[PDB]
Symmetry: D2
């Protein structure tokens, strides 16, 4: 999905992400979550998996990393809002963070 | 190097990095530079090379990435300032970016 | 492309790759090339770029690595032969290696 | 350790690796193990972690990858045999494969 999520889609997709720890940013139609690992080795291994998925689906995250911390913000710049692509990427990220 | 850069060291090593595009932050004793690649494939390949060097040196960057852009801030948190480790990592980053 | 390369396609696309250092295996319809970098940092950075492209194309290489060396064999297992996917991945590999 | 493992060291270090699935190659003083993941994404994420450790310890593996399979052979070419460095790398690899 390249268009903004509908009210119905948000009610059916966001609750699960919120339950997983993601939050909706106050200033942008985007979701955000910070992941913490044991060290940089584990953090970057995680980032490499996310990077691979980003190229597989042609959708990229905004992210900041400092050693074992990875802060991720997902939104679609081509339309300026949250799309199904962001939800899909978030779901993959949760799998990667859980080693699944 | 693990100790803060002396005045002489800064004069000898920082100008080259500034000529290469790095700048010194005003609120912190740290250097910064935004790199712009063609796409994320190039950007992450570059990040992977920097990540390898980070573990080789046990010195890590503070960095942000969005598609083809990579913003890097370097400083030594252990002593709260710039050290030769930051200079060496920045020099490696320049080679990897080229 | 997902179907086996035709005679015309092979004549049009393979010579360039051979000029670049790729060779055709004798026991399989596949192309091969060993890349030699300066070190593992360069080699793995290169591998990371190829890995990203592999997932973008959903087409994977058969590769071996030891420090600065990376041996790559390309073929399409789905049909047991060379396809345009192999040619396109090889061309990307050439750019990444440069 | 940059020298070959002693008979004593082999008796105290190899059993654990054998128990983990590693085997001693017949033609070389090296250890070998094949790892299988769900897909290439997981396999390469694993490889990135191993790559990071290889640069951290300045010791590199011989490895072959085809999609979800990663075959790893560990030995020290600077002396032509198995060293403490190979054991250390093997132990890290086991952690990475287990997501630890």
């Amino acid at each position: 999905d390249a268009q903004w999520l509908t009210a119905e889609e948000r009610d059916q997709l966001i609750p699960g992400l919120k339950a997983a720890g993601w939050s909706e940013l106050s200033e942008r139609d985007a979701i955000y979550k910070e992941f913490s690992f044991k060290n940089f080795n584990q953090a970057f291994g995680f980032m490499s998996r996310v990077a691979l998925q980003a190229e597989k689906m042609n959708h990229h995250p905004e992210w900041f990393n400092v050693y074992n911390k990875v802060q991720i913000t997902l939104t679609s710049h081509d339309c300026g809002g949250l799309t199904k692509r962001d939800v899909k990427l978030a779901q993959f990220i949760e799998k990667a963070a859980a080693s699944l």
